[PDB]
Amino acid sequence: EIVTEEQGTVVQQQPAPAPTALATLATASTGKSVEQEWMTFFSYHTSINWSTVESQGKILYSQALNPSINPYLDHIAKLYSTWSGGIDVRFTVSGSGVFGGKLAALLVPPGVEPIESVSMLQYPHVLFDARQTEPVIFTIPDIRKTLFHSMDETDTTKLVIMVYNELINPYENGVENKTTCSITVETRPSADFTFALLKPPGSLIKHGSIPSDLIPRNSAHWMGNRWWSTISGFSVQPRVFQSNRHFDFDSTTTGWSTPYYVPIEIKIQGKVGSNNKWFHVIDTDKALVPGIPDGWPDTTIPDETKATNGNFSYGESYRAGSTTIKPNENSTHFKGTYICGTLSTVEIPENDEQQIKTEAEKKSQTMYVVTADFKDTIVKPQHKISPQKLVVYFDGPEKDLTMSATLSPLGYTLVDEQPVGSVSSRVVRIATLPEAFTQGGNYPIFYVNKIKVGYFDRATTNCYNSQILMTSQRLAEGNYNLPPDSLAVYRITDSSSQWFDIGINHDGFSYVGLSDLPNDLSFPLTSTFMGVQLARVKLASKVK
Amino acid sequence: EIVTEEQGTVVQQQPAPAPTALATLATASTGKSVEQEWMTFFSYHTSINWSTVESQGKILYSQALNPSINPYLDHIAKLYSTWSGGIDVRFTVSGSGVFGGKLAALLVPPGVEPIESVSMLQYPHVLFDARQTEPVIFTIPDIRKTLFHSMDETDTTKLVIMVYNELINPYENGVENKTTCSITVETRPSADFTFALLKPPGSLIKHGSIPSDLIPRNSAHWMGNRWWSTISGFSVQPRVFQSNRHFDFDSTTTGWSTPYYVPIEIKIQGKVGSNNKWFHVIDTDKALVPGIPDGWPDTTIPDETKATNGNFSYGESYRAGSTTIKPNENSTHFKGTYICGTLSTVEIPENDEQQIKTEAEKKSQTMYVVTADFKDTIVKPQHKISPQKLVVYFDGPEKDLTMSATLSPLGYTLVDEQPVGSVSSRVVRIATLPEAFTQGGNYPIFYVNKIKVGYFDRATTNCYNSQILMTSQRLAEGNYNLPPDSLAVYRITDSSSQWFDIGINHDGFSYVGLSDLPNDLSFPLTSTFMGVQLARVKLASKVK
Amino acid sequence: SGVFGGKLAALLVPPGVEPIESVSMLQYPHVLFDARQTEPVIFTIPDIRKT
Amino acid sequence: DFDSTTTGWSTPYYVPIEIKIQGKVGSNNKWFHVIDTDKALVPGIPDGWPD
């Protein structure tokens, strides 16, 4: 016997009413009419502020065709794996009848990235005046070279709206008297829009999905990559770099820790006649790399020093004013290490010879972890990590003890006026060090955290990060698609009326269209995915 | 001017092709036919194992009508706010022609919870034999007393399948020779099924949604409520209780910390001529309750002791064998406190009189936090927390220092053989202490963690939890609906072939249909939401 | 043997999707043949492509 | 409680109480302790023990 997809004998149940009755009762109270109701109404998309300052050429809107534009389509598309068809877009302009000015509408073919310039108007285009009343509906046709689209495709037709003729106001007093009118954009799926093949519930996607959730909605959720503190600033460098918790669009990592902040479980060795301060780490419980423990800080001491017992000691030229800083003043032998509380617990042999148990009865102490070279007399900085260069510093034991501990990064032994990991030479590599250079008009950036120091009341220093923590987790555990020649763009909007575009390249680093972002930024920031653009295209921004 | 929902003038764009052409190309390569394809095929639901052991009366399947049954309907339902109509269910039985036996199909009205008993067959019912071939399709009609359904409704019609006549096999050798055949259940939305009113994208739900995601899919993600370790066992008590990170279905908490594990930021005071070990906490940076710091452990010391300097010291009758334990052996003055690493940093007055800076140049030390009474000479246990009873223990300072720190719970000072928080009297209340008692045949349970101690090599003790951490976060930040008389049920399935039902009551505590769960349980467990049942109904289980 | 029991489900997974060993895959259109088959079942695999 | 809940330790029925007492050797006292009980709702406390 063969059972088809709907095959089966239907049996009637005794306690069952007449469907038609209840059916209409529903339709009646509910008002149900059509099925894909979203086909019968325009849904908000975005809005445009056309001011009298924007001159001829300025692009005020550039959207590419894609089911994502419509919240409804976007949701349904999740069940399917194919799409095709266009999407209608409605612009509703509302300016004074006294105004003057005209916008231009272009339809750019697929496979060609439009540039912002008047020369764009040397292409067939439609105009609509500022005093336009009834909304205009432009249909973005699905010009494609394939039989249908894949959920991962993004190179489609594009509708661009640009300033044709400057906005004018007869009452315009001058330049410092900007005037502006709004334009609201809405979408409605076109008659020929269609989702195609359904995909089995648990199946996986052979070609990753579009990266639209790599940067959380509110900066309130922007934890760091290096440190766990909440991001509170940016840094536009001509060259960004990092290797630990940094993750690739291919879900690969040159690091030794996962995209999470978990406690560190090491094991310290202590023999007699050895060192009584700096210790070597042996084995580990939780680790991604066979030897190096998950989470182990990716930084090393600035200069070489001897394994001498010491404590905090910063010159007077520090937190007593706004003076400068001299690398000589700070003489904290364990400068540069990462401060992290712990839970100590030494082992006891069946024949406790020395006063071991005496140590096992001692209160655990905060260690000062780090990665460096150790020859029992000197501690030299080594950025090439290995299951050997793992050293901790504190009071420690003396006899032949095998003390195991559980660390938890909390602070950092201050060193200079410069942020943590701002120097390549000091960043713990491991084989290779990922990096992202300036690309024409896009400069890479570092996400600035705030790590705690260890002597100055409750002060802290700035810590650099290669990517928001969520960005790392998603690139890690996810499967995203992005053509190397391009980058996933996001709109960062300030708590005021300031904003700038951030683009993530295939490697995993974020870029910006500026060579330096402003300091004054009401940080309760917000983000919104824009789409995928080319790297050789300067990113947008309305700062200053 | 008034613009309707689709109003707008359509303008034709110059560079645009003929839609009809590309349209068909799609339809042709894609095979697109109907729109709600899920209306044309049965989708897997669940399966039933009918063995020759199950006797007349046993219910093998009891599903209530609800769009959630169908993965497709379930997804679409998210756009809407109303539903109504039935759903077809297909049973496909496959047993040997040599078998014998019959199952019964009932249709229970809404508003009546069926009980498992033969007396159920004294109700109209349909039978299908074990050697049935072609699948049978039962339609669950939507019998309702309202005009339509709300996404939060759950009290609908119910289809029950029960053993009518024991399964038989002529080759059945005996009792220890169980035989069994499979039955697979599938669903297909009925002709009259309909989603009704759409809901504005950002709007909120006035009546919370059904609790179907309160317990994660894999136990690998089951972190604790009290401790952050991964759950690894259960404990069926005649009375469960907790108050800290425990959350209510109303998103309320009688605790003082949020559903997350974040570092603790306190402030210790130290004056001359005071105590040199146990210290009082002053202010705090991060806290939910105005005075008590977020995360502060919810346990207190067992007995009263004097503020004397001490260290770990457990009798020999501990970790040297499998002996018992005497509360006299353990003389660790700070028994019961929570071990947690920290980052110390004392303040410096503009006129450092005493040797303050001398302290500011000292390596931070692990503190032993806890909640208790303090009169500088004696430390008595007090379960009624307040911004006063916050005391820490360690070496600390002596002069007039205002030392601020940042804690991080890592361990626990062992005390007895019993798990943490297993005693009401010791659990830090605050005004009231939530609890859940046995309910006829359902006994409340505790989720068992594994917290680290502080002296025994790398050993640990069991820690109790009132709810999986995710459960807490969701009840916290979410909006779920559940009639107090009922409880959200979940199927916990062992890595072998063992399983038991867990029901969460409105208060937030989980229950079980047994008075004691087995120890041997391959813990890579899995969970799957079953629905909402009454509390006066013993939960299912196939253990032993 | 004609005395056995059991069903086997067949399904076509479109391109760009990797199947997994889960019953979830059955929450998709599928036909099924029985262990006690008489005459062979022929499934014809369509060539779904965008080229 | 209205939901069959009881903060107590005994059932809504009056049934006999069964306990075990500890006989003291090195002492002459009249008050004895109870080791354990056989029938109980709450492990440890006998069902029906006075209020």
Question: DSSP for A168-203?
Answer: E-TT---TTS--EEEEEEEEEE-TT-EE--B--TT-
Say how many CB pairs under 8 Å bridge A and B.
Answer: 323
* Cα–Cα distance for residue pair B82/A28, rounded to 1 Å: 13
Which residue from B437, B484, B536 is facing D6, i.e. has the nearest CB? B437
B238–D3 C-beta distance less than 8 A: no
Residue B318 pairs with which residues in a beta bridge?
none
Give the chain D residue whose CA is nearest to the CA of B440: D4
Q: Calculate the alpha carbon distances from B248 to B252, B435, B484 in Å.
A: 5, 11, 11
Residues of C in contact with A5 (CB under 8 A): 29-31
Contact present, B259 and B265 (Cβ < 8 Å): no
Q: Which of A459, A312, A315 is nearest to A393 (CA)?
A: A312
Judged by 3 or more CB pairs under 8 A, whether C touches A is: yes
Q: Does B80 touch chain A (CB under 8 A)?
A: no
A199–C50 C-beta distance less than 8 A: no
For chain A, the maximum distance between any two Cα atoms, rounded to a whole number of angstroms, is 98
* Cα–Cα distance for residue pair D35/D44, rounded to 1 Å: 9
Q: Say which residue the tokens 């339509």 belong to.
A: B148
**How many residues comprise chain A?**
544
Go through A271-291 and write b for each residue having 16 or more CB atoms within 10 A of its CB, e for each that does not: eeebbebbbbbeebeebebee
Which residue from B239, B440, B484 is facing D4, i.e. has the nearest CB? B440
Sign of CA dihedral B470, B471, B477, B479: positive
Q: Does B402 touch chain A (CB under 8 A)?
A: no
**Which residues are within 8 A (CB) of A369 and not within 5 positions of it... i.e. 6 or more apart?**
A264, A296, A297, A337, A338, A340, A391, A392, A393, A407, A409
Given phi > 0 = left and psi -120 to 50 = alpha, else beta, which region is A470? alpha
B263–A26 C-beta distance less than 8 A: no
Instruction: Give how far C29 is from chain A: nearest CA, Å.
Output: 6
Touching chains, A (3+ CB pairs < 8 A): B, C
Contact present, A502 and A492 (Cβ < 8 Å): yes
For chain B, the maximum distance between any two Cα atoms, rounded to a whole number of angstroms, is 98
Q: Say which residue the tokens 């096999």 belong to.
A: B169
Residue B281, classed as helix, strand or coil, is: strand
Instruction: Give how far A160 is from chain B: nearest CA, Å.
Output: 12
Which residue from C7, C28, C49 is facing B43, i.e. has the nearest CB? C28
Write out the two tokens for B423.
């005693």
Write out the two tokens for B164.
């009518």
Contact present, A396 and A438 (Cβ < 8 Å): no
* Cα–Cα distance for residue pair A102/B206, rounded to 1 Å: 45
B44–C27 C-beta distance less than 8 A: yes
Query: Among B32, B43, B167, which would you mutate to test the C interface (most chain C Cβ atoms within 10 Å of its Cβ)?
Result: B43
Residues of B in contact with D4 (CB under 8 A): 439-440, 535-536
Residues of C in contact with A152 (CB under 8 A): 16
Q: Does B105 touch chain A (CB under 8 A)?
A: yes
Up-side HSE of residue B284: CA atoms within 13 Å toward CB? 25
Residues of A in contact with B135 (CB under 8 A): 3, 7-9
C17–A81 C-beta distance less than 8 A: yes
Q: Which of B163, B132, B58, B124 is nearest to A13 (CA)?
A: B124
Contact present, B501 and B512 (Cβ < 8 Å): yes
Contact present, B144 and B84 (Cβ < 8 Å): yes
Q: Which of A538, A499, A324 is nearest to A418 (CA)?
A: A324
For strands B233-236 and A460-461, give the pairing. unpaired
Give the chain B residue whose CA is nearest to the CA of C29: B41
B288-293: long-range contacts (C-beta < 8 A, 24 or more apart)?
Answer: B288/B255, B288/B256, B288/B257, B288/B258, B289/B256, B289/B387, B289/B430, B290/B387, B291/B386, B291/B387, B291/B388, B292/B256, B292/B385, B292/B386, B292/B387, B292/B390, B292/B430, B293/B256, B293/B264, B293/B265, B293/B266, B293/B390
Say how many CB pairs under 8 Å bridge B and C.
Answer: 44
Surface-to-core class of residue B150, CB atoms within 10 Å of its CB (0-12 exposed, 13-18 middle, 19+ buried): middle
Contact present, A382 and A372 (Cβ < 8 Å): yes
**Which H or E element spans position A457?**
none
Give the chain B residue whose CA is nearest to the CA of A188: B6
**How many residues comprise chain C?**
51
Write out the two tokens for B187.
């669903």
Domain extent listing, chain A: 1-202, 203-544
Position B199, amino acid = K
Residues of D in contact with B437 (CB under 8 A): 5-7
Select the CATH number that applies to the domain covering B1-202 from these four: 3.40.630.40, 3.40.640.10, 2.60.120.20, 1.10.1520.10: 2.60.120.20
CB count within 10 Å of CB B350 equals 5
Contact present, B98 and B170 (Cβ < 8 Å): yes
Q: What angle do CA A64, C49, B35 make, to 5 degrees?
A: 70
* Cα–Cα distance for residue pair B418/B412, rounded to 1 Å: 13
* Cα–Cα distance for residue pair B475/B482, rounded to 1 Å: 11
Which residue from B341, B362, B395 is facing A342, i.e. has the nearest CB? B341
The beta strands (E) that lie in B170-314 are given as 180-189, 194-195, 233-236, 239-241, 264-270, 278-280, 305-306
Residue A339 pairs with which residues in a beta bridge?
A368
Up-side HSE of residue B135: CA atoms within 13 Å toward CB? 28
Contact present, A446 and A466 (Cβ < 8 Å): yes
B485–D42 C-beta distance less than 8 A: no
B404–A9 C-beta distance less than 8 A: no
Residues of C in contact with A83 (CB under 8 A): none
DSSP assignment letter at A439: B
- Got the DSSP string for chain D? -TTS--SSSS-SS-----EEEPPPSS---S---EEEESS-SBTTB-TT---
Give the chain B residue whose CA is nearest to the CA of C32: B92
D3–B439 C-beta distance less than 8 A: yes
For strands A136-140 and B9-11, give the pairing. parallel
A204–C50 C-beta distance less than 8 A: no
Using what technique was this structure determined?
A: X-ray
B536–D7 C-beta distance less than 8 A: no
* Cα–Cα distance for residue pair B466/B488, rounded to 1 Å: 16
Residues of A in contact with B318 (CB under 8 A): none
Query: Among B34, B84, B314, which would you mutate to test the A interface (most chain A Cβ atoms within 10 Å of its Cβ)?
Result: B84
* Cα–Cα distance for residue pair A182/A94, rounded to 1 Å: 6
Write out the two tokens for B4.
């309707």
Q: Does B171 touch chain C (CB under 8 A)?
A: no
* Cα–Cα distance for residue pair A236/B308, rounded to 1 Å: 55
- Residue window 1-51, chain C: list those with CB within 8 Å of chain A: 7, 11, 13-20, 22, 24-25, 27-34, 41, 48-51
Which residue from B437, B439, B440 is facing D7, i.e. has the nearest CB? B437
Contact present, B399 and B304 (Cβ < 8 Å): no
Which residue from A75, A148, A345 is facing B30, i.e. has the nearest CB? A148
For strands A499-505 and B486-493, give the pairing. unpaired
Residue B222, classed as helix, strand or coil, is: coil
* Cα–Cα distance for residue pair A275/A309, rounded to 1 Å: 10
Q: Say which residue the tokens 């680290």 belong to.
A: B452
Surface-to-core class of residue B163, CB atoms within 10 Å of its CB (0-12 exposed, 13-18 middle, 19+ buried): buried
* Cα–Cα distance for residue pair B169/A159, rounded to 1 Å: 70
